[PDB]
Design a protein around this ligand. Structure first.
Ligand SMILES: Nc1nc2sc(CNC3CCN(C[C@](O)(Cn4cncn4)c4ccc(F)cc4F)CC3)cc2n(-c2ccc3c(c2)N(c2ccccc2)CCO3)c1=O
Ligand SMILES: [Mg+2]
Length: 215
């Protein structure tokens, strides 16, 4: 029930500051990056399930689900992948993310397109193109459901999840959209971006749409 605060490594907080402030034109590549991460997490549970089919019982369906929350100015990207333990959420640091972050920043200084972020293994942080803060809700088969939270600053929190829907297994990113990036709540826009950048995905990409029942 305690909110644990942790500090990012310097290189991660440097990267998040660059991304949250960039005026880069093609911000829609965030969604490709998060879909790719979701797909990778799904691949990992599928791989475990091949030897042990009981690892799927926590959530039998393998999906990616996009949930616009228009009233909250939130976009949720959910997967039923392997998920992250509390120790996985606290271990964003001492990771390959450290190696990805410094060389990507150097590449950006040399003129690399921001869309190359995924090639450096740090495409998660592309969410700061469109969002000023994020909650990462995750449930691994070996642990309880936890919430990781960040505002692109130096600090993050990890809290035992007593407030969100149960994932069963997997991860949900809750993006708190910037006031100029509310186009990513619209069905038409999300469909366009998925179709353009995420044609080759092995799992269903489900879009959750809320419409008024009319006369
Ligand atoms: N939707 C998603 N769902 C999943 S689920 C998953 C599991 N990740 C674990 C990582 C540790 N692995 C252990 C391994 O390292 C694998 N290994 C083996 N040999 C080389 N490596 C290892 C090491 C030693 C060993 F003895 C055994 C091992 F298995 C297991 C999978 C990660 C993940 N993200 C994700 C994608 C990209 C990211 C982040 C999260 N970030 C991030 C963001 C916020 C909080 C924490 C983190 C920040 C950077 O980018 C998703 O977005
Ligand atoms: Mg296990």
């Amino acid at each position: 029930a305690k909110v644990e605060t942790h500090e990012f490594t310097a290189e991660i907080s440097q990267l998040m500051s660059l991304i949250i402030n960039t005026v880069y034109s093609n911000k829609e590549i965030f969604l490709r990056e998060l879909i790719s991460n979701a797909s990778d997490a799904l691949d990992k549970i599928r791989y475990q399930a091949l030897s042990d089919p009981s690892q799927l019982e926590s959530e039998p369906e393998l999906f990616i689900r996009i949930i616009p929350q228009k009233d909250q100015k939130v976009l949720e990207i959910r997967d039923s992948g392997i998920g992250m333990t509390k120790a996985d959420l606290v271990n964003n640091l001492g990771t390959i993310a450290k190696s990805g972050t410094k060389s990507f920043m150097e590449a950006l200084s040399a003129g690399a397109d921001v869309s190359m972020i995924g090639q450096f293994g740090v495409g998660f942080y592309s969410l700061f193109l469109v969002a000023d803060h994020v909650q990462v809700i995750s449930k691994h088969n070996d642990d309880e459901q936890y919430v990781w939270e960040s505002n692109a600053g130096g600090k993050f929190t990890v809290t035992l999840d007593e407030t969100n829907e149960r994932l069963g297994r997997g991860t949900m990113l809750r993006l708190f959209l910037k006031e100029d990036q509310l186009e990513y709540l619209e069905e038409k826009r999300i469909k366009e971006v998925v179709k353009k950048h995420s044609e080759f995905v092995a799992y269903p990409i489900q879009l959750v749409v809320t419409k008024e029942v009319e006369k």
